[PDB]
């Protein structure tokens, strides 16, 4: 029905724009008009509810937002069915709210189910599944499930860099997180090798397939020991700089720190 | 924190 | 299809008091219309009129006026001159001009509008009477005393005849015209007019006058010798005329009856 | 003065 059909869109059209105050009454009225004809159960009621709770998130009315999305998923599951992408998206969303509240163990099953729905709909090695694994890896980081963090970020990388570009920032993000998860574990050389990889991916795109003369930043310093515009790669210079502080390679930690200093 | 998934409106 | 619902929403929300909520809906709807049709279109004119009515309530009067001028410029090209929409707009944008104090500026607008109305409907049509009534006030503020009389007098010849005798519109006009007579010094004319009004009312209240059923004024003007708001104003107004006539008992009893209402 | 709203209605 046009009456509702266009209004429903206007809600999205405005909530996205940032005109939340404009959106909320449209939403509210659309709700009362939606329930008159079709009732509580409807995919559009769910969509609209999600929009409302998305306003409540920004407002930091977290428990309300969470409850609202629970109701929305209860509607979404009956209408759209379990193992639906909408259901997955909702489970992902209402887990971020649960995580933010500090209910980390409560968000984990939601996320786990969501990932299982995503895998069913798309595939084992799909990028969204990877985004979900990345999301899931943080829920386990706060929990202190060190090994799981490694597994999930490790699985994420096997879906990122292979499907995506090697120089990609998402890939670097993951390789930076996973290398921190290794630092915690005591897998020091693994994290070191990871950081070297990160540096090399940027260094080659800036210059070209490295030769004796084109040598990378770390190789210069680790050799000096004997005798970068990116933020994600500056963090890397500093992070590897610490590993060389542990490795006793001071000159290396210094040259890395200096290069990082020169970038800011 | 965790990342939000907006495909419900987008 | 597109306009059909938004047009309803702006109004739905403006009525509610959700002015801030309404104005952007209209504003975007405008830009979505201008994409396809541009400025030249009757709905663009309609939407603009809707916008300016929001600006009226907000007391952004010159903006509203300007907006309706633009709207009339669109309406005339699209709908054509001597159109009822054009007339309605000229009527509207004359009320804003009058309210602003531009009484002489509102007069040509109104004069043209009445001439469009007459062309479309007829010389003795009720809307034409409503327009004449509107014009009579623009001439009242100007101090064109005779014009006021002529216009309200013409209004009555199109009202009471076309309308029911017992109409409030007719009483409204007869109350205005009788004030315009009070100003002129046509005292007995205004007095007779007020008597007519009272007589129109007494009859709906009770059957037509008989020996004992006599009206309120006749009771008082005879005593002298030996519920409606528009008709309460009349009791008071005629009560003043008897104050002018020295017929105090009449003014006393009229005032009392008005007090009892 | 009296308004004439038929321009929107």
Residue numbers in the entry:
A (entry chain B): 195 to 421, 443 to 479
B (entry chain C): 204 to 213
C (entry chain A): 196 to 421, 444 to 478
D (entry chain X): 205 to 213
Kindly provide excerpts from the paper associated with this entry:
Certain cargo molecules bind to the KLCTPR using tryptophan-acidic motifs, which bind to the inner concave surface of the KLCTPR, spanning TPRs 2–4 (Araki et al., 2007, Dodding et al., 2011, Kawano et al., 2012, Pernigo et al., 2013, Zhu et al., 2012). Tryptophan-acidic cargoes activate kinesin-1 by releasing the KLC LFP motif from the KLCTPR (Yip et al., 2016). Intriguingly, TPR1 forms a similar dimer interface in all crystal structures of the full-length KLCTPR (Nguyen et al., 2017). Notably, we also found the same interface in our previously unpublished, 4-Å crystal structure of the KLC2TPR bound to a tryptophan-acidic peptide derived from calsyntenin-1 (CSTN-WD2) (Araki et al., 2007). The TPR1:TPR1 packing interaction is unique in being found in every copy of the KLC1TPR and KLC2TPR in all crystal structures, suggesting that it is independent of crystallographic environment or crystallization conditions. The amino acid residues that form the crystallographic TPR1:TPR1 interfaces are totally conserved in essentially all Bilateria and over half of the non-Bilaterian species in our datasets, across all phyla. These observations suggest that the TPR1:TPR1 interfaces observed in crystals of the KLCTPR are not simply crystal packing artifacts and may be functionally relevant. Thus, the KLCTPR possesses the propensity to self-associate via TPR1 in a manner that mimics JIP3LZ domain binding.
